[PDB]
Amino acid sequence: TXPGVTXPGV
Numbered sequence: 001t002x003p004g005v006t007x008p009g010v
Contacts, residue, residue: 001008
């Protein structure tokens, strides 16, 4: 995720 907690996605 995120970053943080990429995206999703990317």
